[PDB]
């Protein structure tokens, strides 16, 4: 249904060169101040796990999680940091692929 498109998008994000910051949850033990600043963490493997057990009712819920990944990225990382730069590439990728399905 709407979920077949989400499988395609998520697969293509997981394999993207710039996905390396977002494949795994941030470990707050390793990242000073992350727990304080980011209220709702999100990453591609959490989305993949939620998709695998069917925890998305609509495509709009899937997109909310994706946008959360990149909102969190821009909140915590400078736009010219290595992670910020990758997050902009991944955000533009997502917005572009989402639009040529809907
Ligand atoms: C900047 C942290 C961060 C990552 C992320 C995922 S893998 C990775 N890297 C691994 C290899 N190269 C170093 C670099 C790194 O700095 N890791 C943590 C620092 C330390 F202490 F472990 F070295 N960073 N992803 C997101 C979404 C992040 C944030 C805060 O938004
Ligand atoms: Mg937004």
Which short descriptors sum up this protein?
102 residues, mainly alpha, Histone Acetyltransferase, Chain A, binds the ligand CCc1c(-c2csc(N3CCNC[C@@H]3C(=O)NCCC(F)(F)F)n2)[nH]c(C)c1C(C)=O, binds magnesium ion
Description:
With 102 residues, this protein is mostly helical. The protein has one domain (2-100): Histone Acetyltransferase, Chain A (Up-down Bundle), CATH 1.20.920. The chain contains 5 helices and no strands. It has helices at residues 2-15, 34-37, 44-52, 59-76, 82-99. Helix 1 (2-15) runs antiparallel to helix 3 and helix 4 (59-76) packs antiparallel against helix 5. The two termini are 13 Å apart. The structure holds the ligand CCc1c(-c2csc(N3CCNC[C@@H]3C(=O)NCCC(F)(F)F)n2)[nH]c(C)c1C(C)=O and magnesium ion. The ligand CCc1c(-c2csc(N3CCNC[C@@H]3C(=O)NCCC(F)(F)F)n2)[nH]c(C)c1C(C)=O binds at residues 21-22, 26, 30-31, 34, 73, 76-77, 83. This is Bromodomain adjacent to zinc finger domain protein 2A. It comes from Homo sapiens. Belongs to the WAL family. It is found in: Nucleus, Nucleolus. Residues 1-101 form the Bromo domain.
Overall domain count: 1
Oligomeric status: monomer
Helix run count: 5
CATH topology: Histone Acetyltransferase, Chain A
Which term fits the overall shape?
Answer: globular
Helix/strand/pairing category: mainly alpha
How far apart lie the N and C ends? 13 Å
For CATH, the homologous superfamily is named as: Bromodomain-like
CA radius of gyration is 13 Å
Q: What summary fits the major beta sheet?
A: none
Q: Helicity level, as a percent range?
A: 55-70%
Number of strands: 0
Protein name: Bromodomain adjacent to zinc finger domain protein 2A
Organism: Homo sapiens
Domain Bromo: 1-101
Subcellular location: Nucleus, Nucleolus
């Amino acid at each position: 249904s709407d979920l077949t498109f989400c499988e395609i998008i998520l697969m293509e994000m997981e394999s993207h060169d710039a996905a390396w910051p977002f494949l795994e949850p941030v470990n707050p033990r390793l990242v000073s101040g992350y727990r304080r600043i980011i209220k709702n963490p999100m990453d591609f493997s959490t989305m993949r796990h939620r998709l695998s057990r069917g925890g998305y009712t609509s495509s709009e819920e899937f997109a909310a999680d994706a946008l959360l990944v990149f909102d969190n990225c821009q909140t915590f990382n400078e736009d010219d940091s290595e992670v910020g730069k990758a997050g902009h590439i991944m955000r533009r990728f997502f917005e572009s692929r989402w639009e040529e399905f809907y």
